[PDB]
Structure formats: C-alpha cells, structure tokens
C-alpha cells in the first residue's frame, strides 16, 4: 500500500483498457489476419494500440489533482462502451452519439439488464474503486513534468516506430481496413465526442433561417373542383425487406395484406440510413441521400413545410420517440405524441403496459370532420420492431411463432427464438397497416384515399456478430438498409404505382408525396417515385 507514482497508475490503466476494452477489435484483427501467419503485424498492432491508449491517458491526465477523477471517468466510459461494442457489435460515430443523446428513459430501460450491470461492476467500477482507494504522491513540478514528457515520448515512439518498421502493412491497413479503427474504445468515443462538439458549435453558430428549395411548387388543382385526397403515410420503425412474405419468406408474416386488394410491394427499397434520427429527416428532405446532411436537416425546407404552405393541412401522430426535427416549422397543435396514456386511449392490454399503434386510429374521424373539404396527410409513426425488446411490441393475440425470446439479451436467445419474436412484431405491424387500410376504405365515398408505408432502417439479427441497428452509413450491413415498402390506393383514384421490381431508395418519398397531391417542383421532379 506504499504510495504509487501517478505515471505507473496511468500505464496500468492504459494496459487494462487495451486488454479488456478492445476485445471486439482484437477479435476482428485476429480473425481477419490469422495469428499463425501475421505474427509481426498483430504484435505491432497491439503495441501501437497500447501506445495510443497511453498517449490519450497522459494527455487528459496532465494535472495532478484531477488524475483520479479523469481515470475514473475513462474507466467507466471504456467499460460502458465496450459492453455494447462486444455484445451488440455496435460502433460509436457522430450519428451514434447523436442517437444516444436523443433517447428517452423508457427506451434506455430495455437496454439495461443484469448482465450489463454485472459487467460494468466488474470492469469499470471495481477498477474504479481500485484506482480511487490507493495513495498517490505528486512530486515537484519539475520532475513531474520531466516524467510526463518521458511518458509522452515513450508513447509516441510506441506509436510511430511500429508504423515505420511496417510501413507497407500499415499503409494498407489504413487505406483498406478503415472500419476497424472505429471498434477501438475509448479512443473512438473521445474522437466522436470531439467531432460532435464541433458539429454542435457549427449548428449553434448557424443562422435560424429557412433555405428554400420548392419556391416554385404550385398545386395543379385545388380541392374544390375534384375529390379531396387523403393519405395516411405510415412511417415504419425497424423492418427488413427480406422478412416480408411478398418478397420471399418461408413464414407468412403479412397475411392480412394478401386479402386486401390493391396493395403493391416494391422488392428493392434502400433507406437513407441505419438510424431513425438520421433516416426520418432524409425521407422528407428535397436533397437526395448523396447530398443530405443531418447537421442541417431541420434548417432545410422539407416536403411537409411545402404541403402545409400550399394549403394541405397535415397531422402527425407520433408513437416511437419524436418527430426527429421534421415537424418543427409547423404549429405544435398538429404534432400530437401518443406515447403516454394521456393521449393513447388503447393501452394496458399487455403486462408490459405499453401503448400500441392501433390506438393511434382512435379519434381520426374528429380531425377528418374538422378538415371536411380539404386535402389531409395524416402521417402515422410506428413503434415497429424496436429492439432490443421485440417481444414487447405485440399482444398475445399475435403470439403465433413459438417459442419467443423473452430474455433481455440477444446473445443468449437462439437465432430461431429471436426470429420468432421479430416476425410476431412484424405481424403486429401488418395488423396495424391492415386496420389503417380499412379505415381509409371506410372513407372512400368522400375522399381519394391512399396509403404509403416505408421503414426507416433494417436490423441485424446475428449475421457476422451484429445484433442492432446504428452502424455508420459508409459500411453498414445491407440488412440494416433493406426496408419494406407498401402502397395501397383505391381503384377509382387513378393513381398507378410503379412496377414491383423497380429499384427505389428513400429519396423517392418526397416525389411520391408531391405527386399524390399533384404538385410539381423542379427541385425533385426528375426523381423516381413510388407512383407514376
């Protein structure tokens, strides 16, 4: 229990972090490059990783009176990031941290589980108490600064010398194998925090004006000489394009749409991104997926603002989290969240006490009557297949695929037991869509109803170790971007959808919404749309 120097504690913290907090990155390195044939490269990778960790720890623990709190914070952050990068195989980018800071406690509670609590207690709390309960003496500023540079130069040498000795190998690694650099913790969380702070500063310094894109958008015919239109655009949460029956699936997860005539499903739809906060604004922005920037998504003009300005009253009935920045320029009286029982009349039908999606159709007739004569776009948000709790997104009426994964951890349930729960939640989504279609049909005698559904992103369910959405748009698996798309309309409105095999992306949503109300804007007119 003799007084230990701060520098040996810093080195021990760096060793512990490089040993325990980089399990996924080390496994990926040892599985891409076998240890039996790439001994030198893997050894240099370990050495440079330890050097980077030591450099990071020495730079943020420069002071003496903040050494212990900074070490505690680094240990806790490393453990909390490493658990999620290990079990769920997720990385940390600016978008991932943005999603992390836009969450509600209800969603966070599902991620919390006994195994995660035990792993932090063992990896970022027990070392926390070990570090906080030892005695450390700070020498004079001269010798302390001398030893600090010595450590700085040692870490810089351990970083650079393996790079120079393995110049070609590391050049190839940094040119071709970029994504592995995102699996290292807690360095990647620190870089993401810095980048996010820069983005937030740029957003704050940005003006508070609207960059217009559809100033020339004019309605072809007003809702006085024609039958007024009414579109229920069902924003979809997690769903996979290959898990629907129409595009090929052994099980029948969409039986209630087969008996509904007029439903057209497109087999190839690629979403804008793998996260809801990054995909929902991209659905409604006039910029395509190659130009859309999430940092300025809310400032740019969306199709919703154009539709509201042109005279089409709009309604949003939130269910999952929030409009994510798209329903902001319109009056608050139109955005009505349905997460809590204060608004959703259909709840407490399950032991989990969750409010379902079918309750969002209770009271739409009041809005229809209040808007008797004008176009409406009643957009509905879905809870969908939101994880890691697929078993809580459906009622026992749809408990058709047995067994189901009732556990809170995906790594323990077998693949079939997770597939069953996911498909049951898909069945619940199917039932919601069918009920929406029937509600549209009951108003056919006075409106030209139409329905459009598209999910914001896909899901990973065990392939290559990934288990949840959130991967960066640059190298995300295809299963996180393949989303189903359905369009149904009455056989008298004269709306002809495209072929089922047409290749479309999330950029096709705005042209479809504009074409539904016969609005032509040169900013988006030359884009593929779900309908002719």
């Amino acid at each position: 229990r003799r007084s230990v120097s701060p520098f040996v504690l810093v080195a021990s913290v760096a060793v512990f972090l490089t040993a325990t907090a980089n399990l996924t990155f080390f496994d990926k390195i040892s599985q891409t490059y076998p240890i039996a044939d790439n001994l030198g490269f893997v050894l240099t990778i370990a050495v440079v990783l330890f050097g980077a960790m030591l450099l990071i720890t020495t730079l943020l623990s420069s002071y003496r009176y903040v050494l212990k709190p900074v070490l505690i914070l680094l240990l806790i952050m490393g453990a909390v990031t490493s658990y999620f990068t290990d079990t769920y195989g997720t990385v940390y980018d600016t978008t991932m941290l943005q999603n992390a800071l836009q969450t509600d406690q209800a969603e966070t509670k599902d991620l919390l589980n006994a195994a995660f609590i035990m792993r932090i207690i063992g990896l970022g709390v027990l070392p926390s108490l070990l570090v906080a309960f030892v005695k450390v003496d700070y020498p004079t500023w001269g010798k302390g600064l001398m030893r600090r540079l010595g450590l700085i130069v040692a870490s810089l040498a351990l970083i650079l010398l393996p790079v120079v000795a393995f110049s070609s190998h590391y050049a190839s690694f940094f040119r071709v194998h970029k994504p592995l650099r995102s699996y290292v913790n807690p360095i990647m969380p620190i870089y993401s925090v810095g980048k996010l702070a820069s983005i937030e500063y740029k957003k704050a310094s940005a003006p508070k004006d609207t960059i217009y894109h559809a100033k020339d958008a004019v309605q072809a015919t007003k809702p006085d000489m024609r039958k007024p239109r009414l579109v229920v655009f069902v924003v979809g949460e997690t769903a996979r394009a290959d898990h629907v029956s129409f595009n090929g699936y052994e099980r029948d997860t969409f039986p209630q749409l087969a008996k509904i005539d007029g439903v057209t499903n497109f087999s190839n739809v690629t979403s804008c991104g793998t996260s809801t906060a990054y995909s929902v604004p991209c659905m409604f922005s006039y910029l395509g997926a190659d130009e859309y920037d999430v940092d300025t998504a809310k400032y740019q003009e969306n199709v919703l603002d154009t539709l509201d300005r042109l005279g089409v009253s709009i309604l949003w009935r939130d269910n999952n989290s929030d409009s994510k920045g798209v329903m902001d320029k319109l009056p608050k009286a139109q955005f009505a969240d349905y997460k809590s029982a204060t608004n959703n009349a259909i709840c407490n039908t399950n032991p989990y006490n969750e409010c379902r999606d079918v309750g969002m159709l209770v009271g739409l007739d009041d809005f229809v009557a209040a808007n008797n004569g004008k176009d409406m776009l009643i957009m509905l948000h879905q809870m969908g297949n939101h994880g890691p709790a697929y078993f809580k997104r459906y009622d026992e009426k749809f408990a058709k695929f047995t067994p189901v994964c009732e556990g809170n951890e995906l790594a323990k349930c077998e693949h079939q037991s997770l597939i069953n729960a996911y498909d049951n939640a898909l069945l619940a989504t199917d039932d919601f869509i069918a009920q929406s279609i029937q509600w549209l049909q009951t108003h056919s005698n006075a409106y030209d109803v139409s329905m459009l559904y598209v999910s914001d992103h896909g899901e990973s369910l065990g392939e290559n170790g990934v288990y949840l959405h959130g991967m960066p748009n640059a190298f995300a698996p295809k299963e996180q971007r393949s989303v189903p798309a359905f369009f149904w309309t009455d056989k008298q409105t004269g709306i002809t959808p495209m072929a089922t095999d047409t290749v479309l992306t999330h950029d096709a949503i705005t042209p479809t919404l504009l074409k539904l109300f016969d609005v032509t804007a040169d900013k988006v007119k030359d884009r593929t749309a779900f309908i002719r």
Partner: antibody, heavy 123, light 98 residues
Framework: EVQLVESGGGLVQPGGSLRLSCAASGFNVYYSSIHWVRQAPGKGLEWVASIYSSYSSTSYADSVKGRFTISADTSKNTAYLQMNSLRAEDTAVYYC?????????????????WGQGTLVTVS | SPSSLSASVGDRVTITCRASQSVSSAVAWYQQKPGKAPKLLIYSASSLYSGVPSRFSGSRSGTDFTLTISSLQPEDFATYYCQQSYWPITFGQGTKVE
C-alpha cells in the same frame, strides 16, 4: 484447405442474366478479399469486381460497371455476382480469387488461389 | 490480347510491365497454364511464394517491374501477367515462352 469452386455457367442470350457462386470450403473463413477475374477466349486476364463482404465495399472495372452487382451470403460462405444486360464481349471464363496472409516484412493482399472456372457463353 | 515477347527458352528471361500507379507493395505475377487456373508465383514484386526454389526471383527498377527466371525451364511454358494495384485491379497484356 482452400477449395474455391465456381458454379452457374451455361448458355445465356444477349440482354439476359446470370448469377454465379464461389467460396466453397472453410479456407480463410469467407469475409474480406475474394475477387472476380474473367478471361476472354485467347485473351489476357481482366479484373471484374472485388467484394469485401463485411464492410459492404465493392469495386468495378468501368467496362463492367452499371450492370454488375455483387452479393454475399456469409451464412453459406458463398459470393454471388449478378450479371444483367449481357453483350457479346461478355463471353469469358470467370474465376474468383481471395487474398490474405503476409508472413513478416513481406505484405501480400493478392489474388492467390482460384477455381477451375465456369464458362459463360452468350449467343 | 496475348503476346509472345521472350520466345527464347533455355536462358534467363526478362519481361517488363509498366505500372501507371507505383504501388510497389501491390504488384504480383501469375503463371497461367494453358488450360488451368493461374498460379501466384512471386508477390509484392520482391518476395517469393512457396512452390519454387528461387527460380523466379523478380525485382524492381524505378516505375518498371521486371521478372527474372534464373535456371532452365523444362517445365513452365505458361503465360505470365503483371498485376498493378489492388483496389482496383488491372492486369497486363500477358507474355508467352516457347
């Protein structure tokens, strides 16, 4: 050992379609590397595409761009190259070749093992 | 299109390929037998792959990479292709010996 074998040849018509398979046996798992190199009859080798299944990063050789699209089934350890709108020049023998292993101070990442090749004849 | 450049046999041979991109760490040669799949002989433009007792040595000279075979070739007589860059990949025009 590595046993990359190819399947899905046969006769096709111009403007048709085809879909090949590769990556049999365990070899170096499956993910990362593995390419596609074709050879016209009595002509030198020409690179077609390079899948990097894991990161969803692919590439094409211009003359085969806009019609070719590579899929990847890691569950079954098999790579697929989807061909659409074939023309007369597309006739060739198609191989698939991985790349891995660097020893020490030697690098690597080359199209090292291949297969017997599947003839793709258009007419 | 193939080319029978050396066409000498029974002595050392030298075949050159012009690398538009330097990428000296991503240059390799392949021995394609007339009916079989190509071999990998000589990689990284300076190293050797298992399967030959240093017959094919290989070397570099500025932007031009050449292949050298030292011993006589009673078994060989195949076609060799230079391979420049890995992402993307371009192959040379090929060579033949007789």
């Amino acid at each position: 050992e590595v046993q990359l074998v190819e399947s899905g040849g046969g006769l096709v018509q111009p403007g048709g379609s085809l879909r090949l398979s590769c990556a049999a046996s365990g070899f170096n798992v499956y993910y990362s590397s593995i390419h596609w190199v074709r050879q016209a009859p009595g002509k030198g080798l020409e690179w077609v595409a390079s899948i990097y299944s894991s990161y969803s990063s692919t590439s094409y050789a211009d003359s085969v761009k806009g019609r070719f699209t590579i899929s990847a089934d890691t569950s079954k350890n098999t790579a697929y190259l989807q061909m659409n709108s074939l023309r007369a020049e597309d006739t060739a023998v198609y191989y698939c070749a991985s790349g891995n292993f660097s020893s020490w101070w030697s690098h690597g990442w080359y199209a090292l093992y291949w297969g017997q090749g599947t003839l793709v004849t258009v007419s | 299109s193939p080319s029978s450049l050396s066409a000498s046999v029974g002595d050392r041979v030298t075949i050159t390929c012009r690398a538009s991109q330097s990428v000296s760490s991503a240059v390799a040669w392949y021995q394609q037998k007339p009916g079989k799949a190509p071999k990998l002989l000589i990689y990284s433009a300076s190293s050797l792959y298992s399967g030959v007792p240093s017959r094919f040595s290989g070397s570099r000279s500025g932007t031009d990479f050449t292949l050298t075979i030292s011993s006589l070739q009673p078994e060989d007589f195949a076609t060799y292709y230079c391979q420049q860059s890995y992402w993307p990949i371009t192959f040379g025009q090929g060579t033949k010996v007789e």
